[PDB]
Amino acid sequence: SNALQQWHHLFEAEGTKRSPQAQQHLQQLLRTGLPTRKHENWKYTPLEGLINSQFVSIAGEISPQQRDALALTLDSVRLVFVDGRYVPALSDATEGSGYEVSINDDRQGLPDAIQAEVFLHLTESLAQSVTHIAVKRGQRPAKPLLLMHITQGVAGEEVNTAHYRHHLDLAEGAEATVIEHFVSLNDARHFTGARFTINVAANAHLQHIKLAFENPLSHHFAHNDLLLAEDATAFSHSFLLGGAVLRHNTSTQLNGENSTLRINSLAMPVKNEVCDTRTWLEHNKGFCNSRQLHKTIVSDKGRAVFNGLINVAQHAIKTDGQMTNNNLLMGKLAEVDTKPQLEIYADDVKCSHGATVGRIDDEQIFYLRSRGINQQDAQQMIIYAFAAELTEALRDEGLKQQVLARIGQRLPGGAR
Amino acid sequence: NALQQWHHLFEAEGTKRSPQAQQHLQQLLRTGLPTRKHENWKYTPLEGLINSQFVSIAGEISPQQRDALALTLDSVRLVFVDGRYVPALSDATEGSGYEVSINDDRQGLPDAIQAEVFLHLTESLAQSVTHIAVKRGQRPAKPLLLMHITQGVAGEEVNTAHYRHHLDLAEGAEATVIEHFVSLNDARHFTGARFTINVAANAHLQHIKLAFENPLSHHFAHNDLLLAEDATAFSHSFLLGGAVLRHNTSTQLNGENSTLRINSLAMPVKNEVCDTRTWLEHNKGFCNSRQLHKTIVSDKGRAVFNGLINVAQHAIKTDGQMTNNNLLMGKLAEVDTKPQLEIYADDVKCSHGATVGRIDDEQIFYLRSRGINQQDAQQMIIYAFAAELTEALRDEGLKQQVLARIGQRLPGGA
Amino acid sequence: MLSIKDLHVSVEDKAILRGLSLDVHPGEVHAIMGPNGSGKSTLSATLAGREDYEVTGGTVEFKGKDLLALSPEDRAGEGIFMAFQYPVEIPGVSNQFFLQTALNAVRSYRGQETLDRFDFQDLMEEKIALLKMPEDLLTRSVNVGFSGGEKKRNDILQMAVLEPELCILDESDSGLDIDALKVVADGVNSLRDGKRSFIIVTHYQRILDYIKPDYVHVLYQGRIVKSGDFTLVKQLEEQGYGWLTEQ
Amino acid sequence: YPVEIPGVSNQFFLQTALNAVDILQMAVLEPVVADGVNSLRD
């Protein structure tokens, strides 16, 4: 099997009116080829379970009952996507919601990639449609927009693959919360690709949340972009809790002065899984403040990978950027690779990065247990304390409890 | 091109090349020269070096020229000029505690901890190897000083000299070794160095490196530190010379209960690029390591930091920290820092941090509002910034000479 | 209620306790003393359930059950509570959430019900007062920002709230002066109901002036080699032991 | 809000400021707080 050939085949599949944009990304995809473990950005992320596999794109259909059984409990404006396809019958109406929504394959407006890379090109080229979302000037929707993704694998050794593409434009003064939720229909492995680009205009405020909760055997490769103008505010929270191999990228450009940015993420790989969380940040204008908190909890035979690039352009005075990566290792076979990368070309700044690696504080666990709390609960209380700063940033208790439930379920002293 | 010329220099004396040297030359020609696209070469320019016409000639220098460039210090001084050990200029080592042999026999040399292009170049071109050893339990009365004096030639050619030394501290041995690099004059040259040290059980090593070459030269070095169990090692590098300097210190902690400290100071001014790099492997558990790398970048200068710490599986009780603090002085100053971690053991305490910013705007005003002019105020702060590193030099006389070298790069000039 | 017989315990293969025997009945206060290195910490660690303490011989029975087979939380359920020499800080976990969770746990075990939210608070207030604790205890993180003296007092508050049967003070008098000692004493003494028992592993003797023991025991190379009542403390002073005094 | 200057001792600080030309610095540099300020009334 030749992955590039397979994907090329899916691109040419009979009955596919692919856009010029998609065609350009296909060429880039075939131009760059697949990286090896010798490539600067791929020393720790395995592609073996992908490079030599047969790929198919089977768009099935599910019932509201199946959707509900996997859906989050939340009052939102929910758009449902199944195996790479928007499913109207399973989605909520958007009229009067505060969100202008159109789903089609017209891509004339989409911005160029901040950081071009092989899997971003793959998704752009195989996405069957683009979700055009916009929030008009000064509008602050009452409910969060929820993009629910349901992907399924097929019987056999073939790997069903679906690629999702969404773009959000937050006009001046607009303030919205958008959530991307990914789940697997069943235990069959699948290859999920996703790309959510977002443009944040002046005085606009974004609350972005990503919940990748797919099964243990799937591959999840995504690349989101955040473009901020001046006086813009953007918060992005990612909880990568699923998949055999997951690689998420968030590339950002602060193209306006006086903006505030926060990008957080939690990686929780369990037995044999690899969770790769990466960010790319450009402080192109001065007077912006950026904060990043990426935490990982690795269980026996799991591997967390962090990569955080921060470039501060010359003239970007008064830049205030921080990045923190705290890693907690659960067993003697767990692994973690972290690579912060700072490129600072302005002196009048305050930039810093910090990363820690260690195991859960056993003295605290024993203390809790000596008062009567069982091992499982003591451990959960401490992990929750560890992730508290990330989960509380959700600013939504109801949602927070479901994310915590997902976290607690992946702990050794819980289910394993 | 550069690779062709170096190959020529290797063959110009082919008859005298050791098998190991030949093996490194092969690896050099195999891997070739990196581009700005290579993972570890994004910020360090090689153009000023690879577009040159090279030569490698050894000239004679008098005791007077040596004395004028030498450090004021009581030590056992070995002198190397234009790539070679010079008997007539070196101190006698008889009864000093240091067993010294200079020859091209490389049979006992350990393999490279981290092989790379310039390490191969140096191994392949070095005329000979300085075999240094300190017997078990022995503690030499004086520190060993290896003074290197390299000169460029008149014209456009770039004279290149490559030095190679290996120090072996037997069990229980304790010794301090100083590497001093100076330029005979203003003519530019390409200096290559490689100092490998084997620290045995219970041995205690103190390593100091003073790269004080001229403003136009290139300095590419790679040192290796190998520690057994219950061993201690402190390495302090003050990289204050050369137009482009790239220094690597690769280390392996192969025994439990060892202590390691590796520090470096870089102060790139006027279109200089100073590249300080470390590679550390905690192969066994129960070891403590600390790294403090500070830079002060001033004009169009660029400081580059790269630090990788790998903690092998089961290396429990590892306690490693790495800190890179960067001070930018002007609007055109630059700094690129990549502290990295590959941790494969859970019962450990590993952390790293990197900071980048300008002089504390509040400390300066407070000082100025008391009568101190701006420059003096900034110098005080710069010195306080570098003091954490300079204070590691217990020999006051040595420390003062290092501070004076630092002063040459300050606004006032002192 | 507690019976320790011919207990042998080693740490990292070093024999620490070499045949320690002790008998504690309901309503008794026992003081264990002696020099450093003779077993104080190993005894406490073994009873609490620290996992790095190898019991190579002997027995420890509590309420007719083998205690050594119980996990730490079950020993607490059974009724054993230990005031740490070094109370642990739990950042991100409020004393309220901690105590509430602990109380429910031991109440569940033991087959009873826990207090009712607001009642739990009427209990706290009463205890925060009894031990001169910060009124904003419930919302702060367990022992974070507390001095050594405050951490010791917090542990006693825990003791009074979780209501154990056998209370062990593991050199928790260390670093405390007459004032703190007196407050700690008022906390422990308030727990004397004639049924609960106490084991005071002394750092120093002064604590025994406020919490008078019924029994006093002296350790020597991991064994109790002398027992008596409170008057024994004065007798030991005549031996000139260096460990007997100076905090 | 007095400013902190790590690495620089008051001695070097004061000596440098003096040869160049809080209440303590005011008294030492001669340009409970009151008694410190009033004593400088010449």
Swiss-Prot record, chain A:
One of its GO terms (cellular component) is iron-sulfur cluster assembly complex. GO terms for biological process: iron-sulfur cluster assembly; response to oxidative stress. Pfam families: SUFBD_core. It comes from the Bacteria. The SufBCD complex acts synergistically with SufE to stimulate the cysteine desulfurase activity of SufS. The SufBCD complex contributes to the assembly or repair of oxygen-labile iron-sulfur clusters under oxidative stress. May facilitate iron uptake from extracellular iron chelators under iron limitation. Required for the stability of the FhuF protein. Part of the SufBCD complex that contains SufB, SufC and SufD. Can form homodimers. Belongs to the iron-sulfur cluster assembly SufBD family. This is Iron-sulfur cluster assembly protein SufD. It comes from Escherichia coli (strain K12).
UniProtKB/Swiss-Prot annotation, chain B:
It comes from the Bacteria. One of its GO terms (cellular component) is iron-sulfur cluster assembly complex. GO terms for biological process: iron-sulfur cluster assembly; response to oxidative stress. Belongs to the iron-sulfur cluster assembly SufBD family. The SufBCD complex acts synergistically with SufE to stimulate the cysteine desulfurase activity of SufS. The SufBCD complex contributes to the assembly or repair of oxygen-labile iron-sulfur clusters under oxidative stress. May facilitate iron uptake from extracellular iron chelators under iron limitation. Required for the stability of the FhuF protein. Part of the SufBCD complex that contains SufB, SufC and SufD. Can form homodimers. This is Iron-sulfur cluster assembly protein SufD. The lineage of its organism: Bacteria, Pseudomonadati, Pseudomonadota, Gammaproteobacteria, Enterobacterales. The gene is sufD.
Curated annotation (Swiss-Prot), chain D:
It is found in: Cytoplasm. Belongs to the ABC transporter superfamily. Ycf16 family. Part of the SufBCD complex that contains SufB, SufC and SufD. Interacts directly with SufB and SufD. Interacts with SufA. Has low ATPase activity. The SufBCD complex acts synergistically with SufE to stimulate the cysteine desulfurase activity of SufS. The SufBCD complex contributes to the assembly or repair of oxygen-labile iron-sulfur clusters under oxidative stress. May facilitate iron uptake from extracellular iron chelators under iron limitation. This is Probable ATP-dependent transporter SufC. The gene is sufC.
